[PDB]
Design a protein around this ligand. Sequence first.
Ligand SMILES: OC[C@H]1O[C@@H](O[C@H]2[C@H](O)[C@@H](O)[C@H](O)O[C@@H]2CO)[C@H](O)[C@@H](O)[C@H]1O
Ligand SMILES: OC[C@H]1O[C@@H](O[C@H]2[C@H](O)[C@@H](O)[C@H](O)O[C@@H]2CO)[C@H](O)[C@@H](O)[C@H]1O
Lengths: 134, 134
Amino acid sequence: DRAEVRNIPFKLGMYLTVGGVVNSNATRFSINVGESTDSIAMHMDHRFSYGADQNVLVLNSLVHNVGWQQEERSKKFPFTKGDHFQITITFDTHTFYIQLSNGETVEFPNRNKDAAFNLIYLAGDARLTFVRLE
Amino acid sequence: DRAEVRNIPFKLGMYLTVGGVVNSNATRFSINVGESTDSIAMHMDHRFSYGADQNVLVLNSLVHNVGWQQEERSKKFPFTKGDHFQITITFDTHTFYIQLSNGETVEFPNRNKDAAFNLIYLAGDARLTFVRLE
Ligand SMILES: OC[C@H]1O[C@@H](O[C@H]2[C@H](O)[C@@H](O)[C@H](O)O[C@@H]2CO)[C@H](O)[C@@H](O)[C@H]1O
Ligand SMILES: OC[C@H]1O[C@@H](O[C@H]2[C@H](O)[C@@H](O)[C@H](O)O[C@@H]2CO)[C@H](O)[C@@H](O)[C@H]1O
């Protein structure tokens, strides 16, 4: 089952740091910040091989009973199957600030202007090893 | 709903630190380390007023489809309704090492000799504000 932190509010100004390991033959895994598995304010998918996407990040939001909004992509991909990764996220009213394993950064809009989130979870072909939310 | 960290293995040698706030009129709240809401290796209940228990800690384990084992109690109680608390837990094969808000400590046996746990959760009349598991 997915790895998740639930009902510990991730509030404006706090930092989230997750560490984990990518599966050896992973297709893709995502890190997700939102309210539920059907309501995601920041989805960041790490695609090793998914349709036409090879070694790319795909970011988006998921709206409950509505679906996926406008995707954003990054070619930054310091991720390796079988190896550890670390991701750090913080946000303000307008922007999610994401930092990747190698120090490179991606930003994604806070489309609802949310000030807090009650669910963080990893899905797909990876596992989490540690978390700091504070 | 309860506050929980699920499927991020709390392994031998790692530290868990949780911060939160006690509800103003709290009866009791617990911090729980185990596998499920019916399988708890270390339950630590903070009882402000519960039956005959006033301002006491009660620790125990809960075995799936079996029930509560032998309780252990502590009179250490540096907890106040409406106020923040912080708890730090680590364990080895035989012992859970718990440190309370004021630096006082409680120990509780690792009765199954478990080396890892997939569920941490808070229940009852409090809320969590931060977590470190690493
Ligand atoms: O937008 C994130 C979302 O993508 C879905 O896949 C998209 C894919 O990125 C797009 O190229 C194709 O046109 O449509 C697919 C279906 O919506 C993933 O399925 C989904 O899990 C999220 O990762
Ligand atoms: O053992 C922890 C467990 O206690 C239950 O309450 C006990 C109570 O401590 C004991 O004094 C009384 O003899 O039996 C009660 C019922 O088992 C709590 O109900 C339970 O939630 C845990 O906190």
